[PDB]
Amino acid sequence: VLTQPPSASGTPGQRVTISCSGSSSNIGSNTVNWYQQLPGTAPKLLIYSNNQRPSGVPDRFSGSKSGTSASLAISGLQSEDEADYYCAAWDDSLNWVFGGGTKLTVLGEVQLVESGGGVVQPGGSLRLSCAASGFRFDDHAMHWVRQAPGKGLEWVSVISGDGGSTYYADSVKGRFSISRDDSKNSLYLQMNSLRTEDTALYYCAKDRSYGPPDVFNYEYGMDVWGQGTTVTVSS
Amino acid sequence: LPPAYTNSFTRGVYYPDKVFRSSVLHSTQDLFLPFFSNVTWFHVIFDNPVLPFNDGVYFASIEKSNIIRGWIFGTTLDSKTQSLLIVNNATNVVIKVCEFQFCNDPFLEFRVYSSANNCTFEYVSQPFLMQGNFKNLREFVFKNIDGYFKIYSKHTPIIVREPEDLPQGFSALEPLVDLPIGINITRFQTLLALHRSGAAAYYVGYLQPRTFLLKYNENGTITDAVDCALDPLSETKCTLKSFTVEKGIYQTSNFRVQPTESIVRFPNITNLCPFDEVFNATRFAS
Amino acid sequence: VLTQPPSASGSPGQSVTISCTGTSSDFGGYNSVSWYQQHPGKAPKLMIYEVSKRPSGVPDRFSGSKSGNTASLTVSGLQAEDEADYYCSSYAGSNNFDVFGTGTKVTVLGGGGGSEVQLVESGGGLIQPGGSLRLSCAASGFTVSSNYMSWVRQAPGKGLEWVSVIYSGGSTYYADSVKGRFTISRDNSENTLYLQMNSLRAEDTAVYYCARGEIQPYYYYGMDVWGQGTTVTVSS
Amino acid sequence: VYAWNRKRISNCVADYSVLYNLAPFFTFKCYGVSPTKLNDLCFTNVYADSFVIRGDEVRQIAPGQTGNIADYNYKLPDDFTGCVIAWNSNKLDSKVSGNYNYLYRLFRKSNLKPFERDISTEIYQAGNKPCNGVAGFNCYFPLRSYSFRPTYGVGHQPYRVVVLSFELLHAPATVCGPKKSTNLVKNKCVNFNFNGLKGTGVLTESNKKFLPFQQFGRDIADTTDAVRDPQTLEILDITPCSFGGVSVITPGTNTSNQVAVLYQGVNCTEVNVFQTR
Ligand SMILES: *[C@@H]1O[C@H](CO)[C@@H](O)[C@H](O)[C@H]1NC(C)=O
Ligand SMILES: *[C@@H]1O[C@H](CO)[C@@H](O)[C@H](O)[C@H]1NC(C)=O
Ligand SMILES: *[C@@H]1O[C@H](CO)[C@@H](O)[C@H](O)[C@H]1NC(C)=O
């Protein structure tokens, strides 16, 4: 569980400070990750390991991990910085807890596309596919990060680059089966025991680490996302 | 080697606590050297016995240039416990707390020890811890506190060229270093420079738990000290904090004789028990 | 899961050059791809362990170079009369079983270990479904308590797969098929080393093989000696 | 992994916060305590043990686990209060010339004692034969080198793993942590915590001649009067903050209600105005 302002505010020209509070079981023993998502488009990585930033993210963002809470800072925000900010952290209980989202509104190359959605009969379901194009799938891990329409994001399951131990969420445990194949870049996620509470996008998120995000508690992040399909069961 | 003896009139007082005091008379209770005690008169004109280290020593190092340049401590001295070499060679006083059986006669280079082990501590302090009739008297008070080693020191030039003996006068000692390494120590061994190619004499006292009254000066130094276990006159200056008592009769501690035997007479015990007859049986039972 | 050709019979002994694709990597760490020749009846026999330096055996099968992402074992010019199955091992990642491949019919024609150390089994004829049956491979030669041995089972039609791995003294790793229902227990340190069934789930009908050496992390071990298996023949 | 360092570090202010910016580490999992609270706990001596393993073997370095490296080269008990700091070093420890330098002791007789180093090179004897030194069919090299190559993928790359074992025996602790300090305010009613001894009062300029070894300073009572700053070598007198009594002078609640106040021990400057004795 992570506490984050639901909808903050701000004025142009100056800077704001978005915070994320967490216990010592998840943040105190790991590193927080800040993700930025524009309204309408797929999310993207903003700040990883609380110290470094990706090549696409400019110096307009900064993060700190003073104590058991994370603090964001955007020196000189503008209209382009009006997006949703999510906090994510790997807890020591084999889970990946995400934030809630911060509506920081101010009114003045490898494709990871996946598919396999569509409305189906309740109770059962179909398989969730994913693909890429020449990105060394063996040396990278994959995550399933679904996002309900209008709601926040949450972590479903993780597969490591080695293809051995895998982890699921607290609600999708048992009735989900994630696996890969020796063919080209792909990812197969089979779902069972559909409870109609799964109307989301199921982002096939690309990572940079190799093993499961439990042994590497300082390099685990999330690379460029991919355009997911809108699966709406609706019973 | 007949070990002689000397006197310790008013020598063996150090600063108990590192607190500034001015124009006051403080009462302290710690390990100190009793006044007018018996201290060995080991003469280094050969001598290096393994004296005990029950609680603290008052090692004197009366020399001329470099005769006494080190000490050693330990309880087993057979490669069982860690040692403490305090060698004082040229601009190096590096203390080693390793564990090794050096030798049976540490004369003094690497001739002190003969092996090494997992040294748990080593101090690398740079400043070394060391005329007609002006010699040099230097005293080092040591203790066995569990916290630190409590190394004290004081150096001063003497005036007259009288035979080797502790002069008459007061001189406090201030702490220099505090080694935080803890190790049980029961004996010690002086490390003298051979330099063969009298001469020197080192005194060794023993500290005791006593009560002292120290007079601090206006700048913060101890002018004089009074022990409460020397004479009935000092007991008055201890029970009433002062250095010049007035004329009259003063109350002091209570006199009491301690016993030296134990009587545990219990009544005669004629009939012990019939258990002896019960136990003795060829066929006890099934 | 690996990729192997179902069969290979065209151009016998001239352009066969079977291999095993489906790696998509650089063979992980130790580039040691083994090749086993499973013959019907007796236990399989080792053919080559590294890409070169074939062991003491037939010298007309060598040059197993790693072309692209697959070890192309050059088998041309060997012979024109053989009925066996070639299996290749790869995917040497940490704690990853099922390193074997699918059944590759390398029969060029189709129609046309005993005294080394020891070979003994239990002979599980008409095994009752469930229960607990113990199978031993007592070796009067090589030590049965110091070397790294393993247990591999194979069923009619399906290929081999890693079923049990046991290290020197302090590891009892189990495969993913049993997932815990199999409990490996070493016998007397100077007599033998046996296994335990522990209430099989009708999938242990395959025949077992107690190998004196590891399969994927294979070491030379002087010589590769196997033992004949026995049919479980469950009656569930 | 068969000969790993055992650096005994002590007598310093271990600033673990600096370790988060020295090198781009990939693992900073501390099992015992939190890194924020680690800088406020004293320790006697830290045992630094470093080695190099593959990427798929970093998971085997845990307080209790089996594996080809966890029970054959380095084992940690279920009491490790340190960290498992590790990072990839595939920039200077991988050249294409043949990396026959490392080893991992593939062969062994039994699991090693936790926190033990076995520096041996004898030929592994697999029983039932006296091996006075031979290599065939009964006794082989118990050591085997890695296959680290630059043109490989993550998971089989040189990963440097360094653990910091902590211990607390019956000895005074040396390594505690870097202290913190603020500005030195002038004479004012404030609170002070100078090197241990705390208190509240006013810090004024003192003219006492302290000895080069005495830090604190007291009076006839057991209260600190003057103290020297342990980071600038300046003496300061500590005078307790201004307190006193408050008396009320009233002509009587029968003729008027105007009253006067008398602050005892005040210099009409640290509370018409009248300064009396
Ligand atoms: C004390 O120190 C002051 C200043 O140095 C000096 O003038 C005075 O003579 C000293 N007195 C004693 C007894 O130390
Ligand atoms: C303590 O550090 C400060 C800042 O570097 C320095 O000015 C001061 O002189 C140091 N302490 C001493 C020896 O005065
Ligand atoms: C304190 O009181 C005295 C009384 O004569 C006065 O002269 C002085 O200015 C007052 N201020 C101080 C120094 O505290």
State the SS3 of chain C.
CCECCCECCCCCCCCCCCCCECCCCCCCCCCCCCEEEECCCCCCEEEECCCCCCCCCCCCCCCEEEECCEEEECCCCCCCCCCCEEEECCCCCCCCCCCCCCCEECCCCCCCCCCCCCCCCCCCCCCCCCCCCCCECCCCCCCCCCCCCEEEEECCCCCCEEEEECCCCCCCCECCCCCCCCCCCCCCCCCCCECCCCCCCCCCCCEEEEECCCCCCCCCCCCCCCCCCCCCCCCC
Report how far residue D165's alpha carbon sits from residue D162's, in angstroms, rounded to the nearest whole number: 10
Q: Is A108 exposed, middle or buried (0-12, 13-18, 19+ CB in 10 A)?
A: exposed
Residue whose Cα lies nearest atom 9 of ligand 2: it is: D232
State the DSSP code for A20: E
Instruction: Give every CB contact of residue C223 below 8 A, 6+ residues apart in sequence.
Output: C55, C56, C116, D137
Residue of C nearest to D112 (CA): C170
B51-52 and B151-157 strand pairing: unpaired
Resolution (A): 3.5
D221 close to B (CB below 8 A): no
Give the start-to-end residue ranges of the domains of chain B: 5-256
Whether ligand 3 lies within 6 angstroms of the CB of D276 is answered as no
Inter-chain residue contact A210 with D155, CB threshold 8 Å:
yes
If we measure between CA atoms, which residue out of A62, A90, A96, A77 comes closest to residue A8? A77
- We find that the CATH architecture of domain A2-103 is Sandwich (2.60)
Residue B158 has φ and ψ, to the nearest 5°, of -80, 165
Is there an interface between B and C (3+ Cβ pairs < 8 A)? Answer: no
Nearest to C44 by CA among C232, C224, C204: C224
Contact residues on chain A for D55, CB-CB shorter than 8 A? 210-211
Residue with token string 């993060």: A63
- For C103, the token pair is 């059944």
* Cα–Cα distance, A182 to C3 (Å, whole number): 8
Ligand 1 lined by B22 (C-beta under 6 Å): no
The shortest C-alpha distance from C94 to chain D (Å) reads: 6
Tokens of B69: 């340049």
Contacts of B132 (CB under 8 A, 6+ apart): B161
Measured CA to CA, the distance from residue C220 to residue D140 in angstroms comes to 9
Polymer length in residues for chain C? 236
**Chain D neighbours, 3+ Cβ pairs < 8 A:** A, B, C
| Sequence-ordered list of residues with C-beta below 8 angstroms from that of D102, at least 6 positions apart, any chain | D1, D52, D145, D146, D148
On chain D, the residues whose CB falls within 8 A of the CB of B24 are 219-220
* Among D137, D75, D66, D72, residue whose Cα is nearest residue D108: D72
SS3 B107: coil
Q: Where are the alpha helices (DSSP H) in chain D?
A: 35-38
Cβ atoms of C135 and C196 closer than 8 Å: no
Smallest Cα distance from D183 to chain A, Å: 22
| Interchain CB contact of C188 with D (< 8 Å) | no
Instruction: Say how far apart CA D29 and CA A219 lie, in whole Å.
Output: 11
In the 8-state DSSP scheme, what is residue D192?
E
Asked if A26 contacts A97 with a C-beta cutoff of 8 angstroms, the reply is yes
Neighbours of A235 (CB within 10 A): 11
Any residues with CB less than 8 A from the CB of B32 and at least 6 apart, and which?
B12, B13, B14, B207, B208, B210, B212, B227
Q: Which residues are paired to C57 by β-bridges? A: none
A113: enclosing H helix or E strand:
none
* Closest residue in D to B20 (Cα–Cα): D217
List of residues 6+ apart from B184 with CB closer than 8 A: B75, B81
Q: Is A100 on the interface with D (CB under 8 A)?
A: no
Which of C168, C189, C224 to substitute to test the interface with D, most D CBs within 10 Å? Answer: C168
CA–centroid distance, B130 to ligand 1, in Å, is 27
Is the CB of residue B23 below 6 angstroms from any atom belonging to ligand 1? no
Please name which of D160, D163, D162, D164 lies closest in space to residue D54, comparing C-alpha atoms.
D160
Q: Which chains touch B (3 or more CB pairs under 8 A)?
A: D
DSSP letter, residue D270: -
Q: Which residues of A touch C1 (CB under 8 A)?
A: 181-182
Start-end of H helices in D127-241 = none
What separation in Å is there between the alpha carbon of D267 and the centre of ligand 3?
A: 6
Residue of D100, D113, D137 to mutate, testing the C interface (most C Cβ within 10 Å of its Cβ) = D137
Q: CA angle at residue D126 from D125 to D128, to 5 degrees? A: 100
State how far the alpha carbon of B42 is from the alpha carbons of A125, B35, B136, in Å. 98, 20, 17
Q: Cα–Cα distance between B30 and B208 in angstroms, integer? A: 8
Q: Is it the case that chain A and chain B have 3 or more CB pairs lying under 8 Å apart? A: no
Domain B5-256 fold: Jelly Rolls (2.60.120)
Does any ligand 2 atom lie closer than 6 A to the CB of residue D232? yes
